[PDB]
């Protein structure tokens with residue numbers, strides 16, 4: 001079945017290798033692991049630790065740390081050629097090292113933006129390969145598609161050779177939280193609005209939002225994503241990707257996001273919407289039905305509570321935050 | 324982009340200064356190109372690579388012929404289609420061996436400034452849920468069949484990588500064109516005639532040869548009634564060469580025969596029977612289950628772009644292959 005009869009129980013002898021562990025998602029995983037006293041030696045790799053696109057450099061952390069579990073979060077996010085080569089080489093290397101070094105379970109990370117361009121909503125995991133992705137990021141998208149397929153192919157090989165190697169994947173939708181990229185120009189909508197509001201509070205200016213503020217998105221707190229990913233590691237046995245998102249009823253509009261940010265900074269000035277900028281797509285809804293059916297009692301952090309925590313982290317660490 | 328037609332106004336004319344690199348030039352398709360190049364005395368220095376020249380899955384080894392020969396054109400036919408041994412045939416290998424070889428070759432093509440590169444797809448990589456006849460535009464409209472999906476996806480990503488390298492060439496102002504052909508079932512000399520691992524038609528030839536030498540019956544699996552399109556490798560080589568000379572579009576172009584020219588599996592078996600002059604019985608082992616009746620691919624694009632193209636009649640192409648097989652059996656791939 002999709003979930004093991006009993007959860008995997010980590011011990012002090014287990015080693016968990018987390019590629020791309022220094023970003024938004026990795027830092028949340030590290031935060032939950034320490035907070036919940038999850039056992040094992042957790043190794044959070046960054047680029048400083050080695051170029052995973054090179055096959056030889058990629059095995060060095062496997063030879064060094066001898067992992068029993070792998071959480072594969074690294075990606076390259078410039079010519080489309082480079083996005084294809086860099087990502088497909090890294091993914092091919094990591095999964096191959098995971099099989100060769102006898103990793104018990106490997107969990108990789110897909111993305112909402114790799115699904116078919118022509119797709120009927122809500123996006124469900126089963127639609128991943130049902131048509132070409134959008135043209136605009138199709139190199140990144142196809143490399144993610146082939147990360148999923150390579151996992152299924154290594155499962156076939158493991159079954160054939162009697163090896164105990166499991167490959168699966170998760171699909172987070174719009175993460176936000178501490179250790180995000182808060183650049184107003186380059187960063188994601190939610191972290192950038194936090195920085196714009198704070199500058200409006202420090203200065204005398206108005207909080208300006210690009211667009212009408214009406215498009216609705218599903219936003220997942222990074223700490224929640226980490227709890228969902230860890231549950232997946234402990235319990236989820238299927239090779240099918242599992243979507244990690246909030247329900248549709250929990251989708252906030254951009255204006256709601258901006259308003260929540262203002263009231264978390266205790267911002268008193270005016271907040272205006274610049275409708276010169278064209279509005280993005282109105283809704284791009286992902287279904288959390290699978291996670292809801294397999295882990296029905298999961299509790300999310302309410303959006304307002306999550307914004308207060310990120311603003312609070314962002315305020316306490318502004319000097320050291322990525323901007 | 325609206326500017327260029329699918330074909331150049333005049334075909335490219337090769338000179339003695341041109342170097343044409345053919346990866347996979349020792350296999351079925353490659354040897355056919357080598358035969359046409361020699362028969363029609365095409366200009367240029369032609370290099371037909373094989374695995375003995377270097378393992379194109381390795382990035383460093385792949386550079387060695389490009390640094391050595393500095394080609395102006397590349398015909399990329401090399402592919403990993405199966406190993407002789409089981410341990411080399413997991414789906415994992417079909418993905419890795421092919422995607423590594425394809426990434427290396429197209430990257431070398433770009434870095435060394437090849438003017439035009441033609442790679443090779445296959446009609447068995449198209450989506451499983453599809454309406455017949457198959458047209459080139461349907462290549463990515465859904466997942467391929469499960470049984471060969473690693474090979475199929477590697478071919479799809481060879482097509483995509485070419486489109487992405489065209490985008491880079493346009494942006495960098497380089498004059499590099501990447502396109503591809505999609506041949507149907509090929510047959511001919513220098514094929515793989517192993518009955519277990521080879522294609523149906525060359526296997527039927529080797530089977531008929533064994534039946535004649537041994538005294539046995541010529542046994543064909545299935546009823547014989549499935550319809551297939553079969554393209555003589557020498558004809559495919561001429562279509563491929565026309566493509567290099569004339570075709571400017573990055574969209575793949577199918578190389579196949581018309582629907583009228585589809586032969587039944589029994590019809591192929593009979594033609595093979597009558598070309599060996601085999602006088603024993605031809606038997607259909609209906610205990611084996613045969614594939615789907617029709618799997619038609621469209622040749623509309625090539626027929627529209629090259630209407631005067633002349634095919635070799637099926638019977639004459641079979642007799643030429645059988646005669647090659649009898650004269651060269653000792654050195655033939657089996």
Ligand SMILES: NC(=O)c1ccc[n+]([C@@H]2O[C@H](COP(=O)([O-])OP(=O)(O)OC[C@H]3O[C@@H](n4cnc5c(N)ncnc54)[C@H](OP(=O)(O)O)[C@@H]3O)[C@@H](O)[C@H]2O)c1
Nearest residue numbers: 020021022023024025046047052073074075109111174175
């Ligand atoms: N955030 C979202 O909303 C979202 C949506 C869909 C999917 N995802 C997926 O979730 C995963 C990461 O989430 P994130 O948002 O936390 O990413 P992130 O914040 O950008 O951090 C990414 C990590 O990847 C590592 N990395 C990148 N290229 C590398 C390379 N060539 N060799 C070695 N390490 C490399 C970085 O190490 P340095 O710190 O040294 O660069 C960093 O630790 C990715 O697979 C991403 O596609 C996220």
Ligand SMILES: NC(=O)c1ccc[n+]([C@@H]2O[C@H](COP(=O)([O-])OP(=O)(O)OC[C@H]3O[C@@H](n4cnc5c(N)ncnc54)[C@H](OP(=O)(O)O)[C@@H]3O)[C@@H](O)[C@H]2O)c1
Nearest residue numbers: 347348349350351352373374378379400401402443445509
């Ligand atoms: N034959 C068909 O029915 C058919 C139908 C559709 C598409 N195609 C396409 O046509 C192209 C060639 O087909 P084929 O029928 O000619 O295949 P083939 O007869 O099996 O020959 C394949 C070629 O690839 C070369 N090769 C394989 N692995 C290599 C490596 N690692 N490094 C260097 N060279 C390597 C072989 O070299 P050695 O000779 O040294 O092993 C041979 O030259 C392939 O891309 C295939 O998909 C064929």
